[PDB]
Amino acid sequence: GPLGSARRLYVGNIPFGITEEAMMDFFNAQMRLGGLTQAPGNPVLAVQINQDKNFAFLEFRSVDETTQAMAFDGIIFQGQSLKIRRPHDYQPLPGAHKLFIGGLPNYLNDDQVKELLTSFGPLKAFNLVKDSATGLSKGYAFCEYVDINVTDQAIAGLNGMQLGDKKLLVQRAS
Amino acid sequence: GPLGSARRLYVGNIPFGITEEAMMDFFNAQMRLGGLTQAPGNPVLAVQINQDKNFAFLEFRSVDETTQAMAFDGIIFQGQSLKIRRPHDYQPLPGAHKLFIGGLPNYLNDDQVKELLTSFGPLKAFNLVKDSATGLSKGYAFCEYVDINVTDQAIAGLNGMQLGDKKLLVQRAS
């Protein structure tokens, strides 16, 4: 962005031969029936389809209704489970999904600690807190994943788990 | 094409000496009389007659008007009851024989990937997925054969095949 792409969503695995009007009608009906609309009228203003590569982009009338519609990921439309995602060019603001990692062995270096974390996916930020005078690790760190959906996967996979004779704490830093 | 067969119908038991222009007028008047058209104008674009074997094909302007015209089975024309059926290669569930091709060496271009596929028969659709930023192959593709009976012979011939450094995955895309 930083503020771009806030009112559009990517839709994959669309049904073969479906029209832009039919897709618009389906999504507007689901928004109403699902209770995700925040005002009278239709949230989806327009749909654009790429036939050759079988995907669509929805254009919404507001920022908050776009976010709500991410909940339809996997909905079945004419036999097809839809893939609903943010636009490539969409990015949350810096530090929005920062993680605190505590209970790490203090003899492990930066690259050795990153190896545990990057097993869930690539990182866009990382720092292991060290004593500045001696350069020695204080046993806690902070990180942020490139894909924000990985954040909850890392928490579920690492929080409360055994690492040596310590139990790790992995949680959102704020 | 796939939906090309979705816009035509087979007509049997045609009277001797009938002309294509006479058939065309008849079906257009029947469509307008039954309130079965979805726009102004004439739903039938063209008619082809085989005189020796007493059958015709009609071509329509839309998928939904074609479906509506199936109701004319048994209709009387010049004293005779016409037989109205779908074409033999009509696909009720479109996109059912679309294939996904994964495990492609990432230096291969469109023409090279097609050459692999066209050993089994001619294609009606093809695309190689690339990164829009660099124009570089993501290593997977999609296709449809002109004859859908070739689909399973292609899967059997290609799926699991060693292609240089990689192993191909060929399956129905869903």
Curated annotation (Swiss-Prot), chains A, B:
Signal peptide: none
Annotated RRM domain residues: 7-89, 97-174
Residues recorded as bearing 5-hydroxylysine in the entry: 114
Disulfide bonds listed in the record: none
Source taxon at top rank: Eukaryota
Localization annotation: Nucleus
Effect the entry attributes to changing residue 7 to W: In DEVDFB; likely pathogenic
Coiled-coil stretches noted in the UniProt entry, renumbered to this chain: none
Modified residues (Phosphoserine): 132
Function summary: Plays a role in pre-mRNA splicing and 3'-end processing. By recruiting PRPF19 and the PRP19C/Prp19 complex/NTC/Nineteen complex to the RNA polymerase II C-terminal domain (CTD), and thereby pre-mRNA, may couple transcription to splicing. Induces cardiac troponin-T (TNNT2) pre-mRNA exon inclusion in muscle. Regulates the TNNT2 exon 5 inclusion through competition with MBNL1. Binds preferentially to a single-stranded structure within the polypyrimidine tract of TNNT2 intron 4 during spliceosome assembly.
Family: Belongs to the splicing factor SR family.
UniProt subunit comment: Interacts with U2AF1L4. Heterodimer with U2AF1. Binds unphosphorylated SF1. Interacts with SCAF11 and SNW1. Interacts with ZRSR2/U2AF1-RS2. Interacts with RBM17. Interacts with PRPF19; the interaction is direct. Interacts with POLR2A (via the C-terminal domain); recruits PRPF19 and the Prp19 complex to the pre-mRNA. Interacts with KHDC4 (Isoform 2). Interacts with ZRSR2. Interacts with the SF3B complex composed of SF3B1, SF3B2, SF3B3, SF3B4, SF3B5, SF3B6 and PHF5A.
UniProt disease link: Developmental delay, dysmorphic facies, and brain anomalies: An autosomal dominant disorder characterized by global developmental delay with intellectual disability and speech delay, epilepsy, hypotonia, short stature, microcephaly, intermittent exotropia, and non-specific facial dysmorphism. Brain imaging shows a thin corpus callosum and/or delayed myelination.
UniProt protein name: Splicing factor U2AF 65 kDa subunit
Organismal lineage: Eukaryota, Metazoa, Chordata, Craniata, Vertebrata
Full-protein positions shown: 148 to 336 of 475
